[PDB]
Design a protein around this ligand. Structure first.
Ligand SMILES: Cc1ccc(F)c(C(=O)/C=C(\O)C(=O)O)c1F
Ligand SMILES: [Mg+2]
Ligand SMILES: [Mg+2]
Length: 712
């Protein structure tokens, strides 16, 4: 049609031209050698990719049947466990080992702090995320509900000094807690100077230095009256800006203008669950943003340069101004018609992402001044893997890609998502398969919950999705992930990460609650916005993660029996009003997410739930909601009438929340006419038949359908 023939492949022209004209120049890779390597890698690895996917289906069919042929009303755990062992689901645990991954940047091996995830197809969000390495604490407190809007402190169209003063007081308390003075409080400071290479703070009746002078990291401006003071605590930097001429500074007792926090230490630029990309045109938009990030010239607003500081001794030094970037590739499941073979078969999308995002990442190892990785690594998050054979396959794919690209072996590092049950229960073997490439493990708990529901779909009805947060299986899974990482030597070598905070407006609650993750020994956890990164950074100043990890060493805190505890609901635990709240809430969140996915190609959206809580949705939260309703429909908790009635009831409410808001197409009243409504319906009624309950097959088909009707 409009394709380019290379060997057995037929490449969409928009992708061929993008690679030749934009991605390849400056890499010293010969274009014809590249495309021949694409041909050879696709041919060589596609059989094993398909075999792994078939093995998923075969395992799930055996588990399905096993549950259907059970009569003994409470599950016999020892029988279930030996069955899983016989069919090859539960594999032997290897002997203890230590990972050997080398060439990794300090932001990953050593620094504990927030990790931000943003959709790579939104250039403005990607830029703000890269720039979120540093963020204003004052803006983050003033603009959110961390400072309550009680009487007097309300936000309005102009500055509220009552509220601003609360902001200042909060930050002063943070400084006392994080960088203590020898005597007195920062609240009473009247000035800062550096004298004989050390920081002295002026109080109203004396002067004082820090309880630990080593927390003084540097300053800007004249040592006489500095323009800022740079502190460090638990490896993260804090900058007090000093400017009495600013409006905030005029009011401040020491002329302080702002407190800047090192925030999003690393950032994951996402090609997976937060974007909608169903063809070559969509992929190229994402590849091109990733290219502009790595070259440094992406602009909508531009990327920040590094920050210059004067050392306490008087010399000069610099600090990175940008978040260290990972890229999340898609996993093993999907194909994309960006490339088809001679038969018209689509090429596996994960294989393509490895080739093209890896190629593009070479630019980030080279000058265009500052770069990405000063130590020479490329950082790829690989999601949705099931078990160690699937991890071994990713490592071989990366190896073959390094060869095509002329890169040293093990340049391409792997952030392993622990977000599928067969990976959880074989986690040690999964780490071992990537022992020379792994740079993190992370509990992707939302995907993990969807896999929990689908895997035991035949077992019975599951608890409500709000109950999953506290079920035995997920508490064991969180502790097990930390134990396995620490036992593999992750302390000082690789990140131990936990999952995403989705209530974008509930920042007071995040600051109160999310501290549990570093208290659990996690050296990183996921945030949805630059503002959330700045606030989550407070937690790493309160919690000494390095100390926590050392205290956790050698502990075995989860048993296989706990990991395998299926979240079945007990006998009729639900009144009719509770069942309908669950159905309505799930249909509302499904419809609000899917309508912007199908009609507008937006892969992450804030969707208010039934309690009017704004939730950041992507495919993982959709997987949970659709699988839970499919499970309730499968075991008779609800009827097919109940599902259809709820969809029809919530759809006009979703229509209203998107009313006017740009060229949006209402779903109501012509339900059977809306591709988006039909996609939402299909995700529920066909959910039990989707592979591992994944949502991409239906989403991609329905988005391509909508694009075709928008052209005829
Ligand atoms: C930006 C955003 C919002 C909501 C999410 F759930 C995710 C996500 O992808 C989480 C996992 O991967 C998982 O828990 O499975 C996200 F990146
Ligand atoms: Mg996930
Ligand atoms: Mg400390």
């Amino acid at each position: 049609t409009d394709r380019v023939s290379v060997g057995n492949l037929r490449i969409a022209r928009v992708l061929y031209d993008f690679v030749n004209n934009e991605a390849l120049p400056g890499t010293d890779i010969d274009p014809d050698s590249f495309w021949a390597g694409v041909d050879k890698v696709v041919a060589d690895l596609t059989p094993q990719n398909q075999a792994l996917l078939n093995a998923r289906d075969e395992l799930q069919a055996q588990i399905d049947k096993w549950h259907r042929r059970r009569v003994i009303e409470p599950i016999d755990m020892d029988a279930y466990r030996q069955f899983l062992t016989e069919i090859g689901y539960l594999l032997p645990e290897p002997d203890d080992f230590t990972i050997t991954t080398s060439g990794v940047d300090a932001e990953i091996t050593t620094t504990a702090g927030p990790q931000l995830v943003v959709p790579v197809l939104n250039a403005r969000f990607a830029l703000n995320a890269a720039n979120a390495r540093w963020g204003s604490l004052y803006d983050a407190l003033y603009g959110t509900d961390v400072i309550p809007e009680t009487d007097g402190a309300e936000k309005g169209p102009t500055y509220n000094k009552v509220r601003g003063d609360k902001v200042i007081a909060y930050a002063r308390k943070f400084l006392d807690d994080s960088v203590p003075l020898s005597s007195g409080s920062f609240g009473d400071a009247t000035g800062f100077t550096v004298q004989d290479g050390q920081l002295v703070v002026a109080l109203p009746d004396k002067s004082t230095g820090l309880a630990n002078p080593g927390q003084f990291a540097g300053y800007t401006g004249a040592a006489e009256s500095p323009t800022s003071v740079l502190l460090i605590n638990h490896g993260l930097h804090i900058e007090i800006l000093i400017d009495p001429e600013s409006q905030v500074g005029t009011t401040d007792r020491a002329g302080v203008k702002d407190v800047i926090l090192e925030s999003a230490i690393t950032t994951i630029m996402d090609f997976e669950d937060s974007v909608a990309a169903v063809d070559a045109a969509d992929k190229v938009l994402g590849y091109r943003n990733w290219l502009g990030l790595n070259k440094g010239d992406l602009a909508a607003r531009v990327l920040n340069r590094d920050r210059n500081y004067t050392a306490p001794g008087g010399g000069q030094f610099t600090l990175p101004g940008r978040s260290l970037m990972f890229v999340r590739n898609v996993g093993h499941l999907m194909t994309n018609d960006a490339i088809v073979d001679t038969d018209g078969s689509e090429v596996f999308e994960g294989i393509m992402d490895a080739l093209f995002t890896g190629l593009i990442a070479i630019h980030g190892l080279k000058a265009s001044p500052l770069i990405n990785s000063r130590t020479g690594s490329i950082y790829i998050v690989k999601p949705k893997m099931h078990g160690p054979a699937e991890v071994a396959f990713t490592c071989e794919l990366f190896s073959r890609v390094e060869d095509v690209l002329g890169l040293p072996q093990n340049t391409m590092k792997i952030g392993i998502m622990d977000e599928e049950r067969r990976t959880t229960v074989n986690l040690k073997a999964c780490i071992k398969a990537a022992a020379d490439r792994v740079v993190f493990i992370n509990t992707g708990f939302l995907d993990r919950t969807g896999d929990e529901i689908h895997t035991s779909m035949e077992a019975g009805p599951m608890v409500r999705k709000g109950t999953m947060k506290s079920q035995p299986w997920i508490l064991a899974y969180e502790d097990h992930n930390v134990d396995a990482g620490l036992a593999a030597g992750f302390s000082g070598r690789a990140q131990v990460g936990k999952g995403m905070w989705t209530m974008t407006e509930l920042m007071a609650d995040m600051v109160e609650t999310k501290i549990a993750q570093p208290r659990a020994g996690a050296s990183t956890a996921w945030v949805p916005s630059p503002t959330a990164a700045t606030l989550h950074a407070l937690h790493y100043h309160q919690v000494d993660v390095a100390a926590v990890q050392q205290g956790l060493a050698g502990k075995r805190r989860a048993t296989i029996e706990q990991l395998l505890t299926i979240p079945l609901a007990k006998e009729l635990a639900w009144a009719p009003d509770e069942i309908r709240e669950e159905v309505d809430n799930n249909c509302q969140s499904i419809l609000g997410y899917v309508v912007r996915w199908v009609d507008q190609g937006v892969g992450c959206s804030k969707v208010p739930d039934i309690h009017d809580v704004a939730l950041m949705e992507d495919r993982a939260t959709l997987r949970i909601s659709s699988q839970l309703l499919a499970n309730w429909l499968r075991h008779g908790v609800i009827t097919s009438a109940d599902v259809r009635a709820s969809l029809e009831r919530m759809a006009p409410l979703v229509d209203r929340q998107n009313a006017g808001d740009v060229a949006y197409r209402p779903m109501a009243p012509n339900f059977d006419d809306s591709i988006a409504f039909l996609a939402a319906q299909e995700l529920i009624l066909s959910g039990a038949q989707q592979p591992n309950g994944y949502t991409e097959p239906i989403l991609h088909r329905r988005r391509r359908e909508f694009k075709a009707r928008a052209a005829e």
